[model samples]
Target chain A: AIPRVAVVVFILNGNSILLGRRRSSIGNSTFALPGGHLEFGESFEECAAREVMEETGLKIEKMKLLTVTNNVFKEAPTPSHYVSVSIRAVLVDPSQEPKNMEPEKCEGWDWYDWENLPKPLFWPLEKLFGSGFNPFTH
Target chain B: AIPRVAVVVFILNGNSILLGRRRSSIGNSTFALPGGHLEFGESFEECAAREVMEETGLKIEKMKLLTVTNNVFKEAPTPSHYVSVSIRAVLVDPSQEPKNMEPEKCEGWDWYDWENLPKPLFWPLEKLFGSGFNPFTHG
Candidate 1:
């Protein structure tokens, strides 16, 4: 099967980054960045902006390329491979807090320092950090 | 139809980037970078390294993300969309020159200053320049 393209955004708030615990079965209970599969005709920018607004109800600006990971979740019940494109961005409105817009998919949102990330991290997040590429550096 | 993910590598030689004239009808006779579709189960790095070696016979290192383009070549005889992932890298052996391995797919390879790119660039290159993102400014 062909690998799927997905986007994972690192929404920076000061020194910390925005994250939400997954409620869905695929990555349930793991903390993840706000993003999802890239649509057929979507650009990375469009997907990132649309996802943040959809999942958190917060608008983001200044999106930049962070890193891309080759994730092969072979250990899962259903094997899958995702070319996860990660991006770094900030909130358009600093005062607004994240909303649990998709409670069925995500538990809720919170911000944690990069050095002190919440565990257990999502597979993409785990792969990203394991590669030693810091999104904050971008 | 699904949008295919492709890699476009900008092989840096000094201030200029390497390019080749495509021989394939899809982007025939247009100046383009060295790269192709991302293989299943391959990372961007692996695809970039492999494609560059395949097309130019030159090894590259320090591959960094340059930009991503949504290329919709709907005007072509056969419509196709490619999520082009552009990357920047330097030659592993700066002393060695490029050699065209597949004359069927490419005319030949050459170096050109980014600010003074040759005319009739490929769609992805044109879109990249149109977006006004300078790859050199990564410094």
Candidate 2:
């Protein structure tokens, strides 16, 4: 099981945020952020950068914290909760595309328009959208 | 072992904040706010309320989020880290006095002048103070 603290990074390109089709047991087949548990001694930015590279085979930098969410997944298929800290970052090389580095956990990566994201988002991210969270605002 | 997310509440009085001397294995002998690990399916405010009551015997309400901190306890005697979520709240009943409900975890509870907080504070709290946190500015 993943730990309670997760870091979600939105690598932005204009009006879009990079997302992936999750294949992991948690939020499988749903669109989700590139994120994982908070490791010891690493700051949120450091965690975000590592997760993005590990999951998508793309390097991200200039990570700015957008918000911290108290995500309660009590009603999820697998009951769990996470204090998800969301961050916004930019691709280290805009010309380089993301690859499906972890096929066992994620299917593929793509960018989605902010106003028109794909249906069936991962639970925490779905909650974030429902709350009218606009990463562009801050 | 506990998760990295811990909730700390600043129980606000007129112009003072309630604090206590630490008596735990993690940050022993330092003055600290009432706090604990984030539990399952609970909001930050909910966790703060539960922790404050559990440690100080003071029922707090109107919990408002102040700020979130990334605390890296690298230089401490014991290495640990936490994402400290700080909150501001009020006593449910102002007439009720706080007690050292858990003597094993805290020395006693007292109201400290914000301008002159008791030293030495827990590492995370000391940083928060240095950052010029003011709950009164909000409410």
Candidate 3:
């Protein structure tokens, strides 16, 4: 089984984080953390940066490791599983305009307060919000 | 042009970092940082962990963004350029052994002092080791 990996960059400003609505023909439309898949030959940092630009059109200047997760779920199928590399990134310009967002990919974008986040997240990210699970400890 | 992305994990303890010798195929005997290319639909972080496991037999607990660089010199002709993303990773255990070592891909492994590194490194990591090159800085 070919294992799929994602370099998910969680853009955070203090307690507020960036959220996206998936565009059609992509993943899901539900409000979720901004991220995308890694391309061949490209560096992981580049992948994260590219995904952010492709999905949100925002430029991320800094990224720090948050966690590496084995996100195997019943719905996604495949007995083996899936993995995700989550990181904390900061926006180069907090107030830069994120226009031309692909409705088929993301219907909307917003900065949500970490203290009070939006419900019905895309997938496993809801639980991944804090460092409590800390899968790295194991 | 299709952009390229990759992640590298540098499992370091304090000022010391991990190092592995390149296989004769890469045309070098000097030790270099360990990492590989990102697979399709795979995340950079997952690649870091998987590559570490595949190459060194060690499981990575967490991986952080170290550097993102464009290997334009290694890129394709005009039209589309390939970009390489380098990720830094820390091994959960420094004592774990490598599952398999491809002498064709890598020769041996060792630990180096991060404070004082060697020149002509693995290539991708050259920029990250710079004085003002902060992995967190986008600019």
Q: Taking the tens digit of each residue's C-alpha lDDT, what string does model 3 give over A1-138?
A: 444556777777666777877653334666776676756555557778888888778999776655555455444434333456676778788788565456666777887786677776765676565545432221
Q: Report candidate 2's interface RMSD in Å.
A: 3.1
Candidate 3: which stretches are off by over 4 Å?
A1-18, A23-29, A33-74, A77-101, A132-138, B1-15, B24-30, B37-100, B131-139
A1-138: candidate 2 lDDT, tens digit per residue: 332888899898788989888886667799998888888888889999998988888889889988888876665678877888889998888878989888888889999999899979987788778878788776
Predicted candidate 1 versus true structure: per-residue lDDT over A22-68, tens digit per residue:
98757789999999888777778889999989999999999887767
DockQ (Cα-based) for each candidate = 0.41, 0.44, 0.09
Can you write out model 3's per-residue Cα lDDT over B1-86, one digit (the tens) per residue?
Answer: 34434456676555666677676434265566667766645666777788777777778776765544544434324433233445
Q: Name the top TM-score candidate.
A: 2
TM-score (C-alpha, index-matched) for candidate 1 = 0.80
Candidate 1 clashes between residue pairs 3 or more apart in a chain or in different chains: none
Candidate 2 docking class: acceptable
Candidate 2 runs further than 4 Å off: A1-3, A75-78, B1-3, B75-78, B136-139
Candidate 3 Cα lDDT to native: 0.62
List of clashing residue pairs for candidate 2:
none
The candidate 2 chain B region of ten consecutive residues with least summed lDDT is B1-10
Against the true structure, candidate 2 has what lDDT? 0.84
The interface root-mean-square deviation of each model, in the order shown, is 2.0, 3.1, 7.4
Give the alpha carbon lDDT tens digit for every residue of B1-139 in model 1.
Answer: 6677888898888889888899875888999999998877777888899999999899999988776766777776777767788888988888978999989999999999978899899877887788787888886
